[PDB]
Amino acid sequence: ASLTEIEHLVQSVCKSYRETCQLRLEDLLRQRSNIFSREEVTGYQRKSMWEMWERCAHHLTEAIQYVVEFAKRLSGFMELCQNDQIVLLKAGAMEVVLVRMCRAYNADNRTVFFEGKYGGMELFRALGCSELISSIFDFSHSLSALHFSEDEIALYTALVLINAHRPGLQEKRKVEQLQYNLELAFHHHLCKTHRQSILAKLPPKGKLRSLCSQHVERLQIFQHLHPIVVQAAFPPLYKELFSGKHKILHRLLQDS
Numbered sequence: 399a400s401l402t403e404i405e406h407l408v409q410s411v412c413k414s415y416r417e418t419c420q421l422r423l424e425d426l427l428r429q430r431s432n433i434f435s436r437e438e439v440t441g442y443q444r445k446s447m448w449e450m451w452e453r454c455a456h457h458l459t460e461a462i463q464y465v466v467e468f469a470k471r472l473s474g475f476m477e478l479c480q481n482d483q484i485v486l487l488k489a490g491a492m493e494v495v496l497v498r499m500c501r502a503y504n505a506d507n508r509t510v511f512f513e514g515k516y517g518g519m520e521l522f523r524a525l526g527c528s529e530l531i532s533s534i535f536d537f538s539h540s541l542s543a544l545h546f547s548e549d550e551i552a553l554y555t556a557l558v559l560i561n562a563h564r565p566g567l568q569e570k571r572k573v574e575q576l577q578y579n580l581e582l583a584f585h586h587h588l589c590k591t592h593r594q595s596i597l598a599k600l601p602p603k604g605k606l607r608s609l610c611s612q613h614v615e616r617l618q619i620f621q622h623l624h625p626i627v628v629q630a631a632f633p634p635l636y637k638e639l640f641s642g643k644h645k646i647l648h649r650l651l652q653d654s
C-alpha cells in the first residue's frame with residue numbers, strides 16, 4: 399500500500415456512494431419544512447400492524463438495494479469470492495442503512511423522512527415495537543450531533559461493510575487487506591479535513607449490532623403472529639436477510 403493509492407481509494411469510495419446514495423442530501427434537507435399533520439399521523443396510527451410492517455419492510459428493502467449496488471461499486475469488493483460477498487452483505491446491509499438513515503433524520507424537531515414527509519417516533523406506533531423505533535431514532539440523533547459529511551458517510555459505511563471479523567469468510571486475509579486500506583483512506587480524509595476528533599465520538603463496537611438483533615427479534619415476533627403476511631406480502635430480499643439462505647442476493651450480484 400502507498401499514499402497516492404490511498405488518495406485514489408478516497409475518490410473511489412466517495413464516487414461509489416455519490417452514485418448509489420438513494421436520495422441526494424439537499425432533496426432530504428429541502429423537505430424538512432414538509433412535516434406530517436396531526437390528522438396524517440393519526441392515519442398511520444389507525445393502520446393495521448401488518449400493513450405498517452409491509453410498508454416498512456418494503457422501504458427498508460428499497461434502501462438495502464442501493465447498499466447492494468454500493469457494495470458492487472466498491473474497490474476490491476467484486477474481487478472477493480461470492481461466499482465472502484454474500485457473508486459481508488448479509489451482516490452489513492442493515493447496519494449501512496441505519497448509518498445512512500441519519501441524513502433523513504432532522505435533529506431539530508426529532509423527525510425522520512418517511513413516505514414523502516417528515517414525522518416523529520409516533521408515526522410508527524402501529525408496528526408495536528416502540529423500543530426499537532426509539533432506539534433507531536436515538537442512534538440517528540447521535541450521528542446527527544457528529545455533523546457528518548457525505549464523503550465521511552461514504553468512507554465510514556465502506557468500513558461498516560468491509561469487516562474481516564464476520565464469521566463465514568473463507569478468504570479472511572483478502573478482506574483484512576481491503577479493510578486496512580479503507581481504514582487508512584477514512585483516517586487520511588479525517589486527517590486532511592481536520593476531523594480526527596470524531597474518532598472518539600463514533601458509535602461503540604456492537605452498537606449497530608444491537609439495533610440489527612433488535613430488528614430481527616421484533617420481526618420474529620411479527621412472523622409468529624402473522625406468518626402468511628410475511629410469506630405473501632414481504633419482499634423476497636427482506637425474507638432472505640432477516641427471516642430464515644434462498645439465492646436472491648446471488649441474483650443481485652451475478653447481473654449488472
Ligand SMILES: CNS(=O)(=O)c1ccc(CNC(=O)c2cnc(OC)c3c2cnn3-c2ccc(F)cc2)cc1
Nearest residue numbers: 419420421454457458461498499501502510511512534
Ligand atoms: C437509506 N438511504 S437515504 O437516502 O438516507 C433514505 C432514508 C429514508 C428514506 C425514507 N424513509 C425510510 O426509508 C424509513 C424511515 N424511517 C424508518 O424507521 C425509523 C424506516 C424507514 C424504512 N424502514 N424503517 C424501519 C426500519 C425498521 C423498523 F423496525 C421500522 C421501520 C429514503 C431514503
